[PDB]
Paper text:
One such target is the enzyme O-acetyltransferase A (OatA). This extracellular enzyme modifies the essential bacterial cell wall component peptidoglycan and thereby makes it resistant to the lytic action of lysozyme, our first line of defense against invading pathogens. It uses a catalytic triad of Ser-His-Asp to transfer acetyl groups specifically to the C-6 hydroxyl group of muramoyl residues within peptidoglycan. The overall structure of SpOatAC adopts an atypical α/β hydrolase fold, where the core parallel β-sheet contains five strands (β1 - β5) sandwiched between seven α-helices (α1–α7) forming a shallow and solvent exposed putative active site pocket.
SpOatAC treated with this reagent lacked detectable catalytic activity and X-ray crystallographic analysis of a native crystal soaked with MSF revealed the formation of a covalent adduct to Ser438 (described further below). To confirm the identification of the catalytic nucleophile and gain further insight into the enzyme’s mechanism of action, we determined the structure of MSF-inactivated SpOatAC (SpOatAC-MeS) at 2.1 Å resolution following modification of the native enzyme in cyrstallo with MSF. The MeS group is seen to form a covalent bond to the Oδ of Ser438 in a tetrahedral configuration and it is well defined in the electron density map. The overall structures of SpOatAC and SpOatAC-MeS are very similar (Cα RMSD: 0.327 Å over 178 residues), but several side chain displacements were observed in the active site on MeS binding. The most significant structural change involved the side chain of Asn491. The presence of the MeS adduct opens the active site, shifting the Nδ2 of Asn491 2 Å from its initial position away from Ser438 and displacing the water molecule w1. Other minor displacements occur in Ser438, Ser461, and His571 as a consequence of the steric effects imposed by the bound MeS. The methyl group of the MeS adduct appears to face the solvent adjacent to Val460, and the sulfonyl O2 (the structural mimic of an attacking water for hydrolytic activity; labeled O11 in the coordinate file) forms a weak H-bond (3.3 Å) to the imidazolium group of His571 while protruding into a hydrophobic pocket formed by Val490 and Val570.
Author numbering: 427 to 605
The structure:
């Protein structure tokens, strides 16, 4: 019964790609904010479900903020996805390999890949993998917020939006969570 549509619940990285996301996904509902974590995205997801605002396809674009609890957080948000939805997980990317949290973000991305592989109503959008392939969008940056000027911000934002668009196309023929 859940009506068609896409809502993205995302973090500052997603918020940085706001215009590119909307351009690549016309009519998608982009709900991205600076401090969003996987924890609060879980709460936002259910709040929207319980008010019947959550459409069929849910994009969770979080993971780089507060990565330490990734196991429980991604287990939980996957568990709490309401019946009737398909879910897309956007893997996080921390580019500074010396960051004390780099290995955690990497573990989080890997664990999200495991959940998407495992779960029929879940699809991966592997920003982590794509981000590693494009060093040019990280020159002069904090290694998380793509682009040091307009051209690489735009190029980075378009790569980010296209990754999610490709996952949505992949998820088109795939089932929803049911019972
Ligand atoms: Na899957």
């Amino acid at each position: 019964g859940i009506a068609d549509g896409t809502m993205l619940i995302g973090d500052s990285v997603a918020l940085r790609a706001n215009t590119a996301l909307q351009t690549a996904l016309p009519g998608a509902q982009i709900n991205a904010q600076v401090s969003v974590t996987t924890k609060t995205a879980n709460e936002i997801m259910l709040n929207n479900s319980q008010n019947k605002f959550l459409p069929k396809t849910v994009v969770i674009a979080t993971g780089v903020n507060n990565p330490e609890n990734y196991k429980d957080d991604w287990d939980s948000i996957v568990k709490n996805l309401p019946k009737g939805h398909h879910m897309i997980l956007v893997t996080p990317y921390e580019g500074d390999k010396t960051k004390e949290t780099y290995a955690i973000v990497e573990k989080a991305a890997a664990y999200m890949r495991e959940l998407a592989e495992k779960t029929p109503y879940i699809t991966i959008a592997d920003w982590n993998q794509v981000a590693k392939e494009h060093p040019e969008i990280w020159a002069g940056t904090d290694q998380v917020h793509f682009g040091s000027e307009s051209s690489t911000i735009e190029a980075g934002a378009k790569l980010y939006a296209d990754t999610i668009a490709t996952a949505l196309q992949t998820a088109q023929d795939k089932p929803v969570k049911s019972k």
